[PDB]
Amino acid sequence: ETGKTCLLKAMLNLHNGQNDTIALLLDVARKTDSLKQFVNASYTDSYYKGQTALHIAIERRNMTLVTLLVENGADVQAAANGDFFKKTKGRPGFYFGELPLSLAACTNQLAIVKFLLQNSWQPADISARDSVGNTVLHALVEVADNTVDNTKFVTSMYNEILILGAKLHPTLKLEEITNRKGLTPLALAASSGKIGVLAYILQREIHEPECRHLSRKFTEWAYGPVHSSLYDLSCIDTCEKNSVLEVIAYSSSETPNRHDMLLVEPLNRLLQDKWDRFVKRIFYFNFFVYCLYMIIFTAAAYYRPVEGLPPYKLKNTVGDYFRVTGEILSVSGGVYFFFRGIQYFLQRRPSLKSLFVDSYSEILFFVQSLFMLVSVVLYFSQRKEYVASMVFSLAMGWTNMLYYTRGFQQMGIYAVMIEKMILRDLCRFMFVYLVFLFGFSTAVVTLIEDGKYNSLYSTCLELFKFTIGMGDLEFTENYDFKAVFIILLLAYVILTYILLLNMLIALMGETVNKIAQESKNIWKLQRAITILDTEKSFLKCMRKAFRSGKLLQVGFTPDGKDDYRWCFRVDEVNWTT
Amino acid sequence: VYLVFLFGFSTAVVTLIEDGKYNSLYSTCLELFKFTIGMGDLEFTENYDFKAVFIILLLAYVILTYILLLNMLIALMGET
Amino acid sequence: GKIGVLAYILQREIHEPECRHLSRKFTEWAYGPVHSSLYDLSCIDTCEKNSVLEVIAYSSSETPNRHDMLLVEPLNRLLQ
Ligand SMILES: CCCCCCCCCCCCC(=O)O[C@@H](COC(=O)CCC)COP(=O)(O)O[C@H]1[C@H](O)[C@@H](O)[C@@H](O)[C@@H](O)[C@@H]1O
Ligand code: NA
């Protein structure tokens, strides 16, 4: 059924790492006809397909047993590609890369990986890929979970494997190998939210001759307390497939450490530098142009004609020429924002949930433009209702100005606090409030069906007035069920003020250094997105966003060639040697 | 932030209704400001041609203004 | 409301010869970092006299640790 052999049974059932049956079975296999097909026996059931004796030896941490298995000619490139050993985590399983080298690496067994790479009989292929296209480094990235001990052992194993691979194959660049999705280990770590691995990779130093070129952090010069270091920006700002900033900024909002991954040492200063060099002036220019657009729109709408039945004839006086010019400019701006919204939605392809849980401002600007277009259509159709649509554009046009509070730290954080308070707390309050309002409105309309309480709309407005301090408890009318009406109104007022008090108290549970920290990180992420969009637009056919220049870091690769890497300078001071 | 919101809604209200306490920007700004201090006017006893659109604007303004006030009050407790 | 004794009893492990049947928490299998465990659930879900869940839920509110006794490892997962 499963294909289990006597060898696998002996491998599974042993005590203290020893079972003399294994050696006897191997000797009998040698003497009978051959050992090759016996030692390399493996399961055939799809749930455990591909597993052989080497995997069991590695799992049980038995060095002598795996050494014997390799000595007898065991295949060290077998793929344990059963359903148990892969993703689709709807069931028990453990994905490790399907290969014995990846299995030893992922279980923190350094001696076994060293033996597998540097044995006398059959060395392992360090560059091999599994069914998904993942190398050993991709597997190491996959098994990370950002805890302390996990990060420690994964980092150490990653460093050791990289150094050994450099020594055995000086011409091999392991970190450039991509899986089926086109992701390198750095891109995979960045997009998956593996902050501990990213923080190691981006600023690693390897102080060992003949493999110093593997480092990404160097030292340009040193004085006494002060010294200057260089950070490599290869595939950080531009990569032509997937840069770190691109995969962090444009993630799908489900990455666990989406906000925190921008706080590592090189990226924060890189984004601040990009902001300070060229992006700030363009942002302020766009803000100014939007302000001019809104002033012209407001002035044009203010002086509309009051005659009925549009369209209106153009007169020969000056004010009408200015008015029609303003109308034309407003409609042009609406068309511009309409096309920009379409371009965003087509170029990003949001997944029907990323539309609303993120990117609100795109929706708001698009809705403003839709109102403008509906106003135009009604204007030329000889309808007077266009004014209504126009004003719903105009009011929105002012509130959308809050978009430009980013670029200023305090106002940006304040706006982020506003947005989160709306999206988290108000939605819960309004549901309960509307339930109470509708219930008491129906009761009041039923009790009194005349005199300002003959409909649900009027009664709802009259009860809403009580919530804003504009109520009416005079009781001058001669109702049939007065003294029952009074009890209902008093109960409604008391319950509504209990609800308001409870809301106010509940909102204090966010000022425990909770929102204060989540904001400023959300603001930094927003400004990062703005920087990336501005760079991608660039408005001039100019792409001079590069950093400190083609500096020479080491200049001595394993070959005679010298290397240049577009580094970023950081100067530091330390008064404790 | 409050002044930006007030100016925007005042211009919208003057444009929608051009007579009867809403024929100037100063008067409309005062009338909308009265809501913030609990002295508003939601009687709707006049015969405006754009009634029932005016109500929606006033309700939206009131809700947004109280959102801003709540956000201020909560945010200012981070200094305590 | 003896939280400590309940927490001990519900997940005790006795690994010794001739008396391991006294355990209520067992190990089904172990891969490397991953493994699977089994909880007994005898007289937790139903026993027709006094189950743990019925006793905790329908207490008279004078029990000290009425809220915390449902946070022990098997009961929270069972209820979810
Ligand atoms: C006439 C009636 C008028 C009604 C107007 C109603 C208020 C207008 C307010 C205008 C503010 C414009 C704006 O700036 O939009 C705000 C949110 O808008 C709202 O509150 C909508 C309320 C519905 C920011 O959204 P943002 O596009 O920055 O997305 C954020 C990411 O960038 C970030 O990384 C985080 O992932 C974050 O979780 C994301 O949100
Ligand atoms: Na009042």
DSSP C7-28: HHHHT----STTTGGG-SEEEE
- After which residues are there C–N gaps above 2.5 Å in chain B? none
Q: Which chains touch A (3 or more CB pairs under 8 A)?
A: B, C
Ligand 2 mean position, distance from CA A471 (Å): 8
A403 pocket-lining for ligand 1 (C-beta < 6 Å): yes
Q: C46 to chain A, minimum CA–CA distance in Å? A: 28
CA distance A419 to A403: 11
- After which residues are there C–N gaps above 2.5 Å in chain C? none
How do A567-573 and C25-30 pair as beta strands?
unpaired
DSSP codes of every residue in A131-169: TTS--HHHHHHHT--S-HHHHHHHHHHHHHHHHHHHHH-
Determined by which method? cryo-EM
CA distance A146 to A196: 6
State CA A129 to chain mean position distance.
Answer: 27
Ligand positioned closest to the Cα atom of A466: 2
Nearest to A481 by CA among A507, A455, A445, A516: A445
Question: Which amino acid, residue C13?
Answer: E
Start-end of H helices in A381-484: 386-399, 409-421, 427-447, 456-467
Question: Which amino acid, residue A132?
Answer: V
**Environment class of residue A322 by beta-carbon count within 10 Å: exposed (0-12), middle (13-18) or buried (19+)?**
middle
- Taking CA atoms only, the protein residue closest to ligand 1 atom 1 is A396
Mutate to test the interface with C, among A48, A89, A94 (most CBs of C within 10 A): A94
- The verdict on a CB contact (< 8 Å) between A94 and C34 is yes
The HSE-up count of residue A528 (CA atoms within 13 Å, CB side) is 26
- Taking CA atoms only, the protein residue closest to ligand 1 atom 37 is A358
CA distance C15 to C38: 15
> What are the distances in angstroms from CA B78 to CA A86, A411, A421, A501?
48, 16, 15, 19
Give the angle A563-A568-A572 at the CA atoms, nearest 5°. 120
- The verdict on a CB contact (< 8 Å) between A508 and B77 is yes
Q: Which helix (H) or strand (E) holds C39?
A: strand C35-39
A327 and A321 in contact (C-beta within 8 Å)? no
Strand order in the sheet with A226-232: A217-222, A226-232, A567-573
Q: How many residues does chain A have?
A: 577
B20 known ligand binder: no
- The count of CB pairs under 8 A between chains A and B is 82
A559 known ligand binder: no
A518 pocket-lining for ligand 1 (C-beta < 6 Å): no
User: φ and ψ at A265, to 5 degrees?
Assistant: -60, -50
Nearest to A421 by CA among A549, A509, A317: A509
Ligand 1 mean position, distance from CA A422 (Å): 9
Does B72 reach chain A within 8 Å, measured CB to CB?
Answer: no
Max distance between CA atoms of chain A, in angstroms, equals 114
Which of chain B's residues have a Cβ under 8 Å away from the Cβ of A510?
74
> What are the distances in angstroms from CA A300 to CA A94, A115, A406?
66, 80, 28
- Bridge partners (DSSP) of residue A568 are A231
Ligand 2 mean position, distance from CA B37 (Å): 8
A392 is written with which tokens?
A: 């719903």
Ligand 1 atom closest to the CA of B60, numbered from 1: 2
A103 is written with which tokens?
A: 């299995």
CA distance A482 to A453: 13
- CA of C30: which chain A residue's CA is closest? A59
Does A339 reach chain B within 8 Å, measured CB to CB?
Answer: no
- After which residues are there C–N gaps above 2.5 Å in chain A? none
- The verdict on a CB contact (< 8 Å) between A391 and B68 is no
> What are the distances in angstroms from CA B49 to CA A125, A306, A391, B18, B52?
82, 12, 14, 10, 9
Nearest Cβ partner for A388 among B38, B53, B64: B53
Ligand 1 mean position, distance from CA A359 (Å): 7
CA distance A406 to A415: 8
Q: Which chains touch C (3 or more CB pairs under 8 A)?
A: A
Ligand 1 atom closest to the CA of A395, numbered from 1: 1
- The verdict on a CB contact (< 8 Å) between A398 and B7 is yes
Resolution in A: 3.1
A107 and A128 in contact (C-beta within 8 Å)? no
